[PDB]
């Protein structure tokens, strides 16, 4: 942390009406963040755990709108396939921790315990 901050971002983000949203049949509003090989995600109770961590890997494309930030989930996933929308203004900065994840585990070699 010689700049200012490595991670420990998270995004308050509300559940919004979506086809996917509907088989999960989510309701209320979640928190978002970015991990290193998956996303994050707390809900429950606290302190709390990665339920809806969904894979980058398999997420095939994403996108972020300064209005809304969603992206494409695969298949065989916890919460299932289709698209999730999640509700805030800052969603710019979400994206581009998933980038930067997704860029790291390659920048640097083969990890080894």
């Known amino acids: 942390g010689s700049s200012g901050s490595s991670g ?3 995004f308050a983000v509300t559940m919004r009406p ?3 949203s509907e088989r999960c049949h989510l ?5 978002l963040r970015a ?3 998956a ?3 707390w809900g429950g109770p606290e302190p709390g755990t990665q339920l809806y961590d969904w894979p980058y890997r398999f997420l095939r494309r994403f996108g972020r709108d300064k209005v809304t930030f969603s992206f494409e989930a695969g298949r065989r996933c916890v919460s ?3 698209n999730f ?3 805030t203004r800052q969603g ?3 994206f581009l921790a998933l980038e930067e994840a997704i860029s790291a585990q390659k920048n640097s070699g083969p990890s080894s315990g």
């Open 39 to 41: 996303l994050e995600l």
């Open 35 to 37: 991990g290193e090989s």
């Open 18 to 20: 979506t086809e996917a």
């Open 85 to 87: 929308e999640f509700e």
């Open 80 to 82: 299932g396939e289709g």
């Open 92 to 94: 710019n900065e979400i």
């Open 8 to 10: 420990h971002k998270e």
């Open 27 to 31: 309701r209320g509003s979640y928190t």
